[PDB]
Design a protein around this ligand. Structure first.
Ligand SMILES: [Mg+2]
Length: 1544
RNA sequence: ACACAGAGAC
RNA sequence: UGUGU
């Protein structure tokens, strides 16, 4: 075709301006692939292009019909000249300076007239990923940047425009304004070019361009292994369950029974039709209202049935005295900062009022007499410890034991009551009435409980009421910290968004959370302050007059705390009945001995930031601007109260009611002829009720179930869009918009992620593992050997699987062309041969379970601990193997000799069951996974290995429908979920699915690799068996408990366990994530069958016409969607067409078991303009993501050791809130809460010397020492920590510190070592690492830059890997979070930091004053070359900085926002130092560096680089994708600042 | 109190 | 108990 059309309408805009990358992908459908027979020889390629199949789309019209012959020496670029067929001199274009960059010609150089040259360059990418597609375009720009950049400017009136054409089968990228149909024409021609290239390369050699030596050797190793490796198929058939190879030959060779598939599909269609008529009441004829009332009656009946069922199991008690909140409603006025405990008076009257009064009278009396130490705290001596040198002598060791410990010598009755309250409950465990309380504890509550205090508290309370404290010690400190942090950016629109934060910090809820968080931090600090029997710890909160008596429990775990405060010392209280009762003892108000576990304190430490983020978010969602002041509404109070009660309770069951409200409230989008069926959720609401808030949430959940069944959300099409009406809060029941209803479903994510792994909740994991195993079919006849037409559980149909695999093969060959197996083979061999054994060497976990651990008698003495993968990898390297290809054989031999898999188990938790396998089984698993990943990337509609496809497939479906149907097409969708995915797939299925898509070479390896899954030996926890066998009691109420006890003791034998064995056995079912890319391939095959079947059904019509429709599918691993868009010919035809589509989508629920897939009841079927995929809701043109999901995780206690990486993690979590739909103002508020959290973790409420710390930090503001940097509020979150550090370097005295650190030196950062030290030491001696490793780095310094040549530099690569600063934090598990919380009492004063150096240790105050000591020596500022070297995005950093200057005054207008919120990506923002000079043109770049000497070794000290490894670590040193209206950086700040607000 | 249709914990 | 003299 002509070229001026392509180079036409484009404007020039002066010159020296490129075009933004516009990504185009194959939205449209192609007619097909013609015949491309290729004839060898005649020193050239002689192709025979057949006639293109004609289509109504006319896409394939520019193909060359006939024969074209191109000679050799060009077939190495056959793609280049072929896909651009039909589409000079550089000195001809412009005068030449003869600088040497001449003689290279662009593909198209023609000027196109009009005075602008419009030089364009052509490129091709065979790699099927975005990465190579972008890299080719970038490198084309790089290698033709120079002429356009400078050579053009020297001539009169320059006019140029550079273009790059990059084509791939997946998509095409160009800055050129390019026609859509032209884009798919280019991709089509590229597909023919790829087919021709593969046939030419397969026919003969030397067509392919010479590659690197390492890739050829990598292919050679893999080919030799796959040709040579033998698995001894007889032994793997005999040892494991049904694994005969004959299954593979029968599956691959025998065609599917087309008569069976046709008959089975019709029967399942009839069954689905009957079920749809019966469940949705469609026959006989009834109006919509009558069926809606019938659905209402059935939902009400099922609700009352559930209530009556839960009532009978419960104790029939009308009212209970339990309080939802286990903390007092106290709101004491903050006082001067002091942890001192003073006697005062009035403790004499405490004796009479109860046992708690007796304890609180004995406690304060010891303070008066001075027996207890630490009642007075003097920071003057502690300040000396921080600043003194030689700190081993100065620190008092003996002060730890007796710090604030008192013995009350208490009476008997008080001890009895405390034993009733759990304190010292082992001494008087049995006694009297203790067993009565214990048996009363295990009582399920009744659903008809009088839970009306919760409803009154949520609607009416004093939350979000200004406490009128305003200027008090904690808030003064927070305000000072905020005002110091906002200094480099101190302007207006910072004050406006800081005053809102201070107003939100002065509410009753936030002050209450503040002192509760102080209490939680003090209890975390008291965890390791162990006491003897009868010894308690008095403490006092730094800013509040609250005294706490702590009884630490041995081995951490629980903590016992009793609060006390003078009656005159409580200014205000929270107005609610949800709080627990408090003992009134004269002038003192007391509290019972409540209990919190070691992980319950983490939820209370983050309470103030949680409340602040909830207030800011739910003020944003109601439209109230931060700078405005208004009284809270009903919705605001109810949402904050729900968040408050959820965060304080911290129970897993309570979240499950609100978590499951999503699946019962999404059913209101179900269009007719189907009725909403929200009563599917009742199966998951059978859990026992153990708290009044659970009762209230269940009662409010069932009322939401009646409303959804009664009435669905009406479409209400107003103009060019659909806006659903009738949306309402699930628990509150109050009407609201769509986003609030969606966001309310994620309120339950306010619970802490990790709760515990106790031996009571660990039992139900094995219930999940076993109950599916017991459903194994008796005969293996239906396990892949034949067809069933009615599969039971664990069974599938072979013919249906073959039909799905054939459909996926056809759809892959459609886009990828023929000979797709050749490219897949080459990619697999390349990616297997290149990888070395040390690449896999990273510590995640392994399992030491073996044959020696299979008997419980020999293991009772020992304790089970699991090693890391690095130890096994180092053992393998010491054996001699360095390549991954030389491995795998030994691992498979070991697994076959063992005959099973050795797996251990964790519980963990999600907002879960994970499996850790042995090192031998992991390598073979890694191999079978790296096959499946390369296989599934060819799939056109999965998202697990093609992450771009998630937000591509759903929106591009409308673009297909626009041409294939025209305007007015009706879209019907179906959000799908799968039940029992991990437990329900027999492993023969995945083996056949994977072996379908490979050459015959890999079939033996795959069969051997995943034939081992059919016999698993999973190790249970050792402590579980101790308590299972020690009692030896058959008494139980849950049958699984008795079954597991019987299996262990061997009274009756079962298949899933044996007598006296530590492991449990499981044949049926894969595992979570261990088989992730193969099950995704299976589930892609299943819904590639579904799309073709739906297309055929739509083509055949409903009695013989052609119902025009478009079917599109997306399925990553488990979540999946089916989008069908149709157009009705007539208005009467519309109802019949929609009924046909409803029948088509309802048939899926019955067609899934044919492939051995069980459709869950969480799947929402037959919705119009509503589709959901991976928690991302697509409501027509209004994409909705839960912002509440990401702001609740924005403040996480960081286990990192740098203390400068804490702010990096905070920025990383801040960016995730911005991408979730949060505005810039809300993101700035989240950052202020993150600052509050950061300074809480540094000792705001735990260290008396924190005021001196902030005073010294104000003088020297610097990260890596405890200073927080804040983003610009206009662009908060969109800029990373580097931009903030660059702005600080340019705008404050930190530039002096960096200038002396780098510019003026001839010859930084801190580590803190979270976690213990002896286990790291016990790790190193086990390794084979040489003790002299550091000085072997000096000679041959290429070890740190070249990955692997010989074996000698191995274990040195591993040593420099393990000695990375980030590795040390990886040794620490999740148990170091309480240590990070408790460390705030000694970070500033005591010496825990090292200067990144074991000889020297320094405190934070000492390091800060050494920075002050290092002052007055810093000379100059940042050299402009330093600003480019340290910050290689400095130029566009400045460009963003200028673009943020005009947004300085809060001036704007309130305009109604259009609801067309879609995803929008913003494209904003030293290897040559190694590859040249040091190791084997552009040599002036080293001269441009202008430092150091030209010698790899010695070179004295250019900087503080004492070792070459440290230099390598130093030399190792963002396209944030927002969500808003579709329209650019200036406009984003203009638009996405507040919903409905425009910032001028 | 703590988890839990008692197999823990204190 | 890098524990708050
Ligand atoms: Mg889903």
């Amino acid at each position: 075709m002509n070229l001026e059309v392509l180079c036409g309408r484009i404007n020039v805009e002066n010159g020296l301006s490129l075009g933004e990358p516009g990504l185009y992908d194959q939205i449209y459908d192609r007619p097909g692939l013609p015949d491309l027979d290729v004839t060898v020889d005649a020193t050239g390629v002689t192709v025979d292009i057949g006639a293109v199949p004609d289509s109504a789309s006319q896409l394939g019209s520019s193909i060359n019909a006939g024969l074209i012959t191109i000679q050799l020496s060009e077939a190495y670029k056959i793609n280049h000249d072929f896909t651009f067929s039909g589409l000079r001199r550089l000195s001809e274009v412009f005068p030449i300076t003869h600088d040497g960059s001449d003689g290279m010609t662009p593909a198209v150089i023609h000027t196109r007239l009009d005075g602008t040259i419009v030089v364009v360059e052509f490129s091709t990418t065979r790699s099927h990923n975005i990465g190579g597609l972008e890299a080719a375009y970038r490198t084309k720009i790089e290698k033709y940047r120079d002429p356009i950049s400078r050579r053009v400017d020297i001539m009169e009136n320059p006019r140029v425009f550079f273009g790059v054409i990059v084509v791939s089968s997946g998509g095409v990228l160009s800055n050129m304004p390019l026609t859509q149909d032209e884009a798919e024409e280019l991709m089509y021609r590229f597909c023919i070019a790829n087919e021709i290239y593969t046939k030419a390369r397969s026919m003969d050699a030397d067509i392919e361009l010479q590659k690197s030596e390492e890739e050829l050797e990598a292919i050679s190793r893999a080919l030799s292994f796959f040709s040579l490796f033998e698995p001894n198929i007889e032994r793997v058939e005999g040892t494991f369950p049904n694994s005969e190879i004959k299954m593979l030959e029968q599956f691959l060779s025998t065609p599917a029974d087309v008569d069976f598939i046709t008959k089975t599909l019709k029967a399942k269609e009839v069954e689905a039709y009957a079920d749809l008529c019966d469940s949705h009441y469609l026959k006989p004829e009834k109006t919509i209202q009558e069926r809606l009332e019938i659905n209402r009656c059935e939902a009400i009946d099922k609700t009352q049935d559930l209530l009556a069922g839960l009532h009978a199991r419960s104790n029939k008690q009308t009212s209970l005295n339990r309080g939802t909140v286990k903390l007092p409603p106290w709101l004491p006025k903050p006082s001067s900062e002091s942890i001192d405990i003073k006697t005062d008076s009035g403790f004499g009257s405490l004796m009479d009022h109860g046992a708690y009064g007796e304890l609180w009278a004995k406690c304060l009396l010891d303070v008066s007499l001075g027996n207890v130490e630490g009642v007075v705290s003097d920071p003057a001596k502690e300040l000396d410890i921080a600043i003194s040198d030689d700190p081993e002598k100065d620190t008092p060791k003996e002060a730890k034991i007796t710090y604030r410990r008192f013995k009350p010598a208490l009476s008997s009755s008080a001890r009895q009551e405390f034993s009733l309250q759990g304190v010292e409950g082992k001494k008087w465990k049995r006694m009297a009435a203790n067993q009565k309380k214990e048996k009363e504890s295990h009582e399920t509550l009744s659903p008809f409980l009088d839970v009306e205090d919760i409803g009154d508290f949520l609607t009416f309370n004093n939350l979000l009421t200004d406490s009128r404290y305003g200027d008090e010690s904690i808030q003064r400190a927070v305000s000072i910290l905020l005002e110091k942090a906002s200094a480099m950016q101190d302007t207006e629109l910072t004050h406006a968004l800081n005053d809102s934060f201070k107003r939100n910090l002065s509410s009753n809820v936030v002050q209450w959370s503040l002192w509760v968080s102080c209490l939680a931090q003090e209890l975390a600090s008291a965890l390791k302050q162990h006491c003897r029997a009868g010894e308690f710890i008095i403490k006092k909160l730094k800013f509040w007059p609250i005294y706490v008596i702590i009884k630490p429990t041995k081995s951490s775990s629980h903590i016992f705390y009793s609060l006390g405060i003078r009656k005159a010392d409580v200014t205000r209280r929270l107005t609610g009945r949800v709080f627990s009762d408090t003992i009134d003892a004269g002038e003192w108000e007391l509290t019972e001995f409540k209990s919190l576990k070691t992980c319950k304190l983490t939820n209370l430490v983050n309470l103030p930031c949680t409340m602040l983020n909830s207030i800011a978010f739910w003020r944003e969602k109601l439209g109230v601007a931060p700078w405005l002041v208004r009284k809270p509404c009903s919705e605001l109070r109810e949402q904050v109260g729900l968040t408050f009660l959820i965060s304080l309770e911290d129970k897993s069951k309570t979240e499950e009611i609100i978590t499951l409200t999503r699946y019962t409230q999404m059913e209101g989008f179900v269009s007719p002829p189907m009725l909403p069926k929200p009563q599917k959720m009742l199966g998951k609401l059978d859990g026992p009720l153990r708290t009044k808030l659970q009762v209230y949430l269940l009662r409010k959940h069932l009322d939401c179930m009646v409303r959804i069944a009664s009435q669905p959300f009406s479409l209400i099409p107003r103009e060019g869009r659909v806006e659903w009406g009738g949306t309402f809060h699930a628990i509150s029941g109050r009407s609201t918009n769509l986003e609030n209803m969606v966001n309310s479903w994620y309120i339950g994510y306010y619970k802490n992620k990790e709760e515990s792994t106790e031996l009571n909740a660990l039992g139900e994991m094995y219930k999940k593992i076993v109950e599916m195993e017991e459903d194994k079919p008796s005969s293996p006849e239906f396990l892949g050997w034949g067809d069933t037409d009615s599969p039971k559980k664990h069974e599938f149909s072979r013919s249906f699987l073959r039909a799905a695999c054939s459909s996926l093969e056809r759809e892959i060959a459609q886009r990828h062309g023929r000979q797709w197996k050749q490219n897949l083979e080459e990619r697999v061999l390349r990616e297997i041969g290149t990888k070395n054994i040390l690449d896999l060497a990273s510590m995640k976990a392994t399992s030491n379970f073996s044959k020696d651990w299979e008997l419980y008698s020999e293991v009772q003495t020992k304790e089970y601990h699991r090693s890391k993968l690095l130890e096994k990898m180092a053992t393998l390297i010491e054996k001699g193997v360095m390549w991954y290809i030389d491995a795998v054989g030994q691992a498979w031999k070991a697994v076959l000799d063992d005959g099973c898999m050795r797996i251990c188990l964790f519980k963990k938790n999600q907002h879960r069951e994970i499996y850790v396998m042995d090192a031998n089984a992991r390598l073979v698993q890694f191999g079978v996974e790296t096959m499946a990943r390369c296989v599934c990337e060819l799939s056109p509609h999965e998202t697990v290995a093609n992450p771009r496809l998630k937000n591509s497939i759903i929106e591009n479906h409308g673009l297909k429908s626009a041409r294939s149907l025209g305007p007015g097409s009706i879209n019907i969708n179906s959000s799908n979920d799968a039940k029992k995915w991990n437990q329900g797939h027999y492993t023969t299925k995945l083996a056949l699915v994977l072996c379908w898509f490979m050459p015959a070479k890999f079939h033996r390896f795959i069969w051997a690799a995943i034939s081992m899954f059919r016999r698993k030996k999973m190790m249970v926890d050792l402590r579980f068996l101790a308590h299972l066998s020690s009692k030896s009691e058959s008494r139980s109420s849950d049958p699984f408990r008795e079954a597991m006890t019987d299996a262990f003791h061997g009274n009756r034998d079962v298949s899933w366990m044996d007598k006296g064995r530590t492991y449990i056995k499981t044949e049926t079912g894969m595992m979570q994530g261990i088989l992730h890319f193969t099950s995704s391939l299976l589930h892609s095959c299943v819904q590639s069958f579904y799309k073709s079947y739906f297309v055929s059904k739509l083509k055949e019509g409903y009695m013989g016409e052609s119902i025009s429709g478009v079917v599109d599918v997306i399925e990553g691993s488990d979540d999946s969607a089916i989008m069908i868009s149709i157009r009705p010919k007539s208005d009467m035809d519309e109802v019949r067409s929609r009924f046909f589509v409803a029948n088509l989508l309802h048939s899926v629920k019955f067609l899934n078991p044919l492939f051995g897939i069980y459709s869950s009841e969480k799947s929402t079927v037959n919705t119009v303009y509503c589709v959901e995929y991976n928690s991302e809701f697509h409501f027509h043109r209004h994409l909705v993501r839960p912002t509440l999901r990401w702001i609740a995780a924005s403040h996480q206690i960081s286990e990192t050791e740098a203390l400068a990486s804490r702010q990096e993690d905070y920025s990383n979590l801040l960016t995730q809130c911005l991408e979730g739909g949060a505005s810039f103002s809300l993101t700035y508020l989240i950052q202020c809460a993150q600052l509050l959290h950061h300074y809480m973790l540094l000792g705001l409420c735990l260290h008396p010397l924190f005021g001196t710390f902030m005073g010294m930090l104000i003088s020297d503001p610097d990260p890596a020492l405890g200073f927080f940097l804040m983003d610009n509020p206009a662009f908060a979150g969109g800029a990373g920590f580097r931009f903030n550090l660059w702005r600080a370097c340019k705008t404050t005295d930190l530039g002096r510190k960096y200038a002396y650190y780098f510019n003026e030196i001839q010859g930084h950062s801190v580590m803190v070592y979270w976690g213990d030290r002896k286990k790291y030491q016990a790790l190193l001696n086990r390794m084979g690492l040489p003790e002299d490793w550091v000085e072997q780095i000096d000679e041959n310094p290429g070890v740190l830059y070249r990955r692997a040549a010989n074996k000698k530099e191995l274990l040195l690569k591993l040593a420099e890997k393990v000695h990375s600063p980030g590795v040390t934090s990886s040794l620490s598990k999740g148990h170091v979070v309480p240590r990070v919380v408790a460390a705030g009492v000694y970070l500033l004063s005591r010496h825990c930091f090292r200067f990144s150096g074991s000889t020297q240790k320094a405190s934070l105050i000492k390091l800060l004053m050494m920075s002050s000591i290092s002052a007055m020596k810093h000379g100059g500022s940042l050299n402009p070359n330093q600003e480019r070297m340290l910050f290689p995005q400095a130029q566009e950093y400045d460009r963003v900085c200028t673009l943020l200057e005009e947004v300085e005054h809060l001036t704007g207008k309130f305009v109604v926002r259009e609801r067309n919120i879609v995803r929008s990506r913003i494209d904003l923002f030293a290897e040559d130092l190694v590859s040249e000079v040091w190791f084997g043109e552009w040599d002036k770049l080293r001269a441009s560096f202008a430092w150091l000497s030209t010698d790899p070794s010695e070179t004295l000290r250019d900087g503080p680089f004492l070792s070459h490894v440290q230099f390598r670590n130093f030399i190792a040193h963002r396209s944030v994708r927002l969500l808003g209206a579709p329209v650019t950086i200036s406009q984003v700040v203009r638009m996405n600042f507040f919903p409905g607000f425009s910032l001028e």
